[PDB]
Design a protein around this nucleic acid. Structure first.
Ligand SMILES: Nc1ncnc2c1ncn2[C@@H]1O[C@H](COP(=O)(O)OP(=O)(O)NP(=O)(O)O)[C@@H](O)[C@H]1O
Ligand SMILES: [Mg+2]
Lengths: 319, 359, 52, 385
DNA sequence: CACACACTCTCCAATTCTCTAA
DNA sequence: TTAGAGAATTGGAGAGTGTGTTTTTTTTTTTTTTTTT
């Protein structure tokens, strides 16, 4: 009951959703839309199994991209410190079998990889653009189908990988070439570009009032948040127990907001997309469920779909 | 004896799988093949033996399951409606129901609409999946010559288009099936390999995915992303439906009568409709000709097909939500209600109808 | 009901004043209650001892 | 097998920082700023629990023809704990850790607060370079094998040494190129010294006459220095003063106006702690901060070359992207195809378009243009959108 | 095989029990 | 009441029977998987 009075004090608050994105990664100055994404990643969508035996992904995948200098890895430091069932790994150190699973001998057996060791939690991947593409493709089943399946020597197998991915990346050339849409800054192709639910570009654009604020934070961080890590961890474990329901006004609004994303991504005489697939429709479902989990409400309003839709526009629009 | 080990999807990750010795007696022998997920009922027993008591240094007894029945954990498994040791067996009142529906005018188009009933559109893929899932007829001519009866299918296309969900549905629906993926599948994890025992320490065969799916289906997700050295192991099992090993003084031929369903993406990750097929894909004529249905999926934008698709996907999330006359029977009237909104035919009936039509 | 057996009680002492390392172990302390700190490398099956 | 008053003799002194520098390595001729920084690495900054830590990391770079390896030896002689090894000197798992018939442990571990000396660092294999990011950025290692799931604390101050690849280090060309070493690992060092000098009589007349001065006969705390270091590391734990904060910010702003990532501010904070731990001062002040800068300026000034990029080379990559755009459009106009063999691409682009650009730069610009989706590569074959 | 150890079988005499007369 | 002769039970000599013991284990080829080449 000593703890229940704190959850009661939290869920009653007029502005709790603001207090949550301000309590995430408190050692990192600014980047408030990334704080918001990381909160939603730790809440997740509702996992669903269809009457046809087809499984649907509930977990959210976030990609952070930016300059090689601009704080991205301090999120990965934070998340692997905060979130249960989590691992750190990175691109140059990577391999296909290091990420997923390897086969070991001397009879053969499974050696668990980074995406299995983080099953029901977050796999944090650093240096992601520097990962060899032959090792990058190994996660395409584990990102979407949430299982790793294997056929080698005498050991065929199928393994769980119900893991959220948080990936940190550098542009090809270091500097985010602001002249380009995200689809051109980064060595990723449509198969994996469409797997991540949303992308954040983050930058250190040199300006003196920002520079003086940031330097002031980094010196005060040397021994100079509205919630504690112990409070925020208990709030999340509470929020994760809701399974939000899509109301009829939200169901009908969601179809029009997906049409408005999908109409604009079209290119060439064929009207082919590149970023918008139905994985981004299911991403609005996953995000509006996590947005509802943070509010501790069992039912989705269309305003939570608007908040999800702006979190998708914030990845797409760069000209 | 059968050494039975924990199932890798229930074994917590990074912790070792446990095993037990199981004993099969008269009429239970030869019931299960190495590598199946099996469910045993039996008597848990123990006996003295000195080797335990010697090496462990305590009065400790070895334990054995004397098996009294065996079931093979096929189907969807998160399902209360599927009793008995064989989920693909039918009763007489079920065979009579197959005969009734088989003479429905338009039964083919009902069955095709029931392939992955929660995936919208793609009726050409559902058609190709239905044909591969029932198969043709295998033929032998005066004993001299033979023709392949299995139908192979290539799902080639753009991202986020249910190529992988169609394959994961066929793994639930087919009688014997095996699933494999890209860099996770080797030349001899498909096919077959030779093992050396640590004790008797001479050579034996271990069967790969195309043996463990024999009279069944092998599902190859991200087929374009296999190594060419691994991908070219399939060429014998596509047409000759065999695996001819000659390794370590073992020289022999296994049978491998699978249908193979494969899913791939084009070069650059997207289909480019102005190019010929041989330029959209990194494959070549000997493997492209072994596939005998090709499905091309283009994810083009359209303001009304994307309303119909988005409506179906939104309704499919609400219907599949985990919070949407005794309880063990009463759950089946709601499972039947939800399933029959989507599908012309019950999925439990279609699984048994397919196995019946194949056998 | 059948007859139900004698219950065996595991007395579980805890919260000792002092902790020993694996390198601090000495035969002089045989049969005496210690606490030991260490990291697990392996665990065996759960097996039945013949107790009585 | 096989007193406090002495600290006060040293700790009161006017010359103190220069005394300690000239007595950690008394055979070594000059290189005074190298000695002065290595000294701060021996003491280190400050630590806290509830992030950053008082470990410090230093790279030496320059011709193989000089005493810099002998410095790496003196540091191994002076330091508490620590290990000496080199870049080619083991497999990756032999430098980090492994599992056997059960922990194998290497040079990058079992030296918490101790100087991990490494030589030949330029010719370390890249699989072995890729060991260090978790250690240098998070003080830690992660492993999982054979039922073991585990993390290990690495916690070593690295002292690295590197040669130029091949011939003498050219001074015009950049430090990132001339070591052939990746900027996100290079940017991970707190200080990088170009340990270089020319043939120079007005030095070498002294150095040769100093080196041969050793053979002529039958202030230097020769042991008390390593004990002074040990007692300083035991007892002294600095803190930032408000009068230090205003300068740490102002100097970082000056360097940002001048060209300074926030890793420079993190380096300044930890060095200014070590320069307060030296003098045993237990408190960080303006007079300590100004040496932390002056040492960094003496290191870097003596744009930070990330991705091996330079301003006068990234403009060239953008001109090469334009060169591919025009070169394919004019052939689409004049020739009976929108595609050409790569031999005929090198035989337009390399022969008269510009100063000589090799096939690897063409493949870079063209790949970044596949990502922008303006040409299709097939198999050797390239075709316009 | 053959030569020590482990273990049982059998006989013989050594000791203690019991009764009688000095 | 002591002390000495005759009867019964136990100890252990020693004869007899039965069992286990040598003992190794790297080396050299063949394979299949990861990764560092
Ligand atoms: N036509 C569809 N109808 C309903 N749901 C769909 C449809 N197409 C895709 N989806 C859903 O969106 C996701 C993408 O399907 P998936 O099978 O993972 O894509 P895929 O075609 O194999 N793409 P990829 O893995 O990138 O090559 C899954 O959750 C599907 O359930
Ligand atoms: Mg797929």
């Amino acid at each position: 009951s000593d703890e229940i009075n704190e959850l009661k004090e939290m869920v009653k608050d007029e502005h709790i959703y603001d207090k949550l994105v301000r309590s995430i990664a408190p050692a990192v100055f600014g980047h408030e839309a990334v704080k918001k994404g990381i909160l939603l990643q730790m809440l997740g969508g509702v996992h669903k199994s269809t009457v046809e035996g087809i499984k649907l992904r509930g977990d959210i995948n976030i990609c952070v991209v930016g300059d090689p200098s601009t704080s991205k890895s301090q999120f990965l430091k934070y998340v692997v410190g905060f979130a249960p069932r989590s691992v750190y790994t990175s691109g140059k150190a990577s391999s296909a079998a290091g990420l997923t699973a390897a086969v070991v001998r001397d009879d053969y057996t499974i050696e668990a990889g980074a995406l299995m060791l983080a099953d029901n939690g977050i796999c944090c991947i650093d240096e992601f653009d520097k990962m060899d593409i032959s090792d990058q493709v190994a996660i395409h089943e584990a990102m979407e189908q949430q299982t790793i399946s294997i056929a080698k020597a005498g050991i065929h197998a199928t393994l769980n990988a119900r893991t959220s991915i948080l990936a940190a990346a550098n542009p090809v050339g270091g500097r985010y070439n602001r002249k380009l849409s995200l689809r051109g800054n980064l060595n990723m192709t449509a198969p994996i570009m469409s797997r991540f639910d949303l992308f954040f570009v983050i930058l250190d654009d040199c300006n003196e009032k920002i520079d003086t604020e940031l330097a002031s934070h980094i010196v005060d961080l040397h021994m100079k948040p509205p919630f504690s890590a112990e409070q925020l961890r208990r709030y999340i474990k509470y929020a994760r127990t809701f399974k939000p329901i899509l109301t009829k006004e939200a169901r009908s609004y969601l179809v029009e907001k997906y049409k408005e994303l999908r109409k604009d991504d079209a290119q060439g005489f064929s009207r082919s997309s590149y970023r918008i697939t139905v994985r981004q429709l299911e991403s609005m479902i996953r995000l509006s469920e996590a947005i509802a989990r943070a509010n501790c409400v069992d039912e989705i309003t269309p305003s939570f779909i608007a908040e999800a839709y702006d979190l998708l526009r914030q990845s797409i629009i760069r000209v | 004896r059968v050494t039975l080990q924990e199932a890798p999807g229930t074994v917590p990750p990074g912790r070792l799988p446990r095993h037990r010795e199981v004993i099969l007696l008269a009429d239970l022998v030869d019931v299960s093949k190495p590598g199946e997920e099996v469910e045993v009922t039996g008597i848990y027993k123990n006996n003295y033996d000195g080797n335990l008591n010697a090496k462990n240094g305590f009065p400790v007894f070895a334990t054995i399951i004397e098996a009294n029945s065996i079931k093979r954990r096929e189907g969807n498994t998160a399902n209360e409606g599927e009793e008995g040791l064989d989920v693909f067996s039918w009763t007489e009142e079920e065979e009579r129901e197959f005969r009734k529906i088989s003479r429905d005018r338009g039964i083919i188009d009902k069955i095709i609409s029931s392939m992955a009933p929660s995936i919208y559109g793609h009726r050409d893929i559902k058609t190709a999946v239905a044909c591969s899932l029932f198969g043709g007829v295998p033929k032998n001519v005066n004993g001299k010559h033979s023709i392949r009866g299995d139908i192979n299918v290539l799902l080639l296309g753009d991202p986020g288009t249910a190529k992988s969900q169609i394959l994961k549905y066929v793994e639930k629906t087919a009688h014997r099936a095996v699933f494999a993926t890209g860099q996770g599948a080797s030349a001899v994890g498909l096919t077959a390999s030779v093992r050396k025992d640590p004790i008797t320490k001479e050579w034996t065969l271990e069967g790969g995915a195309l043996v463990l799916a024999d009279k069944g289906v092998c599902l190859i997700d991200e087929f374009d992303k296999m190594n060419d050295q691994d991908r070219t192991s399939i060429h014998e099992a596509m047409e000759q439906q065999s695996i001819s090993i000659s390794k370590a003084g073992i020289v022999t031929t296994l049978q491998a009568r699978c249908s193979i369903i494969a899913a791939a993406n084009p070069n650059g990750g997207r289909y480019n409709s102005t190019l010929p097929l041989a330029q959209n894909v990194s494959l070549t004529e000997p493997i492209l000709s072994r596939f005998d249905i090709l499905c091309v999926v283009r994810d083009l934008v359209d303001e009304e097909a994307d309303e119909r698709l988005a409506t179906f996907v939104v309704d499919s999330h609400v219907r599949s939500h985990p919070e949407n006359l005794n309880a063990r029977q009463r759950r089946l009237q709601r499972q039947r209600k939800k399933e029959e909104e989507i599908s012309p035919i019950p999925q439990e009936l279609l699984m048994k109808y397919i196995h019946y039509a194949r056998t | 009901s059948p007859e139900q057996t004698e219950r065996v009680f595991q007395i579980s002492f805890f919260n000792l004043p002092t902790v020993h390392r694996i390198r601090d172990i000495r035969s002089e302390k045989i049969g005496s209650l210690l606490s030991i700190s260490g990291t697990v490398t392996r665990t065996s099956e759960v097996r039945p001892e013949l107790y009585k | 097998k096989v007193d406090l008053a002495k600290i006060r003799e040293v700790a009161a002194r006017e010359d103190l920082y220069s005394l300690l520098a000239r007595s950690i390595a008394p055979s070594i001729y000059e290189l005074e700023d190298v000695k002065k920084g290595i000294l701060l690495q021996l003491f280190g900054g400050t630590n806290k629990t509830f992030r950053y830590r008082g470990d410090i990391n230093i790279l030496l770079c320059g011709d193989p023809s000089t005493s810099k390896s002998q410095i790496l030896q003196y540091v191994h002689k002076i330091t508490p704990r620590g290990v000496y090894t080199s870049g080619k000197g083991s497999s990756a798992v032999g430098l980090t850790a492994y599992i056997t018939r059960v922990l194998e442990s290497g040079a990058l571990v079992l030296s918490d607060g101790g100087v991990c000396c490494i030589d030949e660092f330029d010719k370390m294999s890249d699989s072995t370079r890729s060991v260090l990011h978790e250690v240098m950025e998070q003080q830690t290692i992660s492993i999982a094998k054979a039922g073991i799931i585990t993390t290990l604390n690495a916690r070593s101050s690295i002292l690295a040494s590197a040669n130029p690849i091949g011939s003498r280090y050219n001074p015009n060309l950049p430090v990132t190129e001339n070591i052939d070493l990746p900027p996100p690992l290079l940017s991970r060092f707190d200080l990088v010294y170009l340990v270089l000098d020319k043939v120079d009589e007005k030095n070498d007349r002294e150095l040769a006459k100093h080196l041969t001065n050793l053979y002529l006969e039958d202030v230097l705390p020769v042991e008390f220095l390593t004990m002074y270091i040990s007692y300083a590391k035991e007892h002294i734990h600095p803190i930032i003063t408000e009068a230090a904060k205003t300068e740490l910010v102002r100097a970082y702003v000056g360097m940002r106006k001048m060209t300074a990532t926030t890793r420079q501010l993190e380096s300044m904070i930890r060095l200014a702690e070590a320069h307060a731990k030296m003098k045993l001062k237990n408190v960080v002040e303006l007079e300590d901060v100004q040496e932390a800068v002056r040492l960094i300026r003496s290191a870097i000034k003596d744009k930070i070359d990330m991705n091996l990029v330079q301003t006068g080379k990234s403009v060239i990559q953008r001109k090469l992207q334009e060169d591919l755009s025009r070169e394919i459009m004019n052939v689409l106009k004049d020739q009976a195809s929108d595609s050409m063999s790569f031999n005929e691409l090198i035989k337009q682009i390399n022969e008269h378009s510009q100063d000589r650009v090799e096939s690897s730069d063409i493949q870079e610009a063209l790949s970044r243009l596949q990502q922008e989706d303006k040409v299709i590569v097939l198999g050797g074959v390239r075709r316009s959108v």
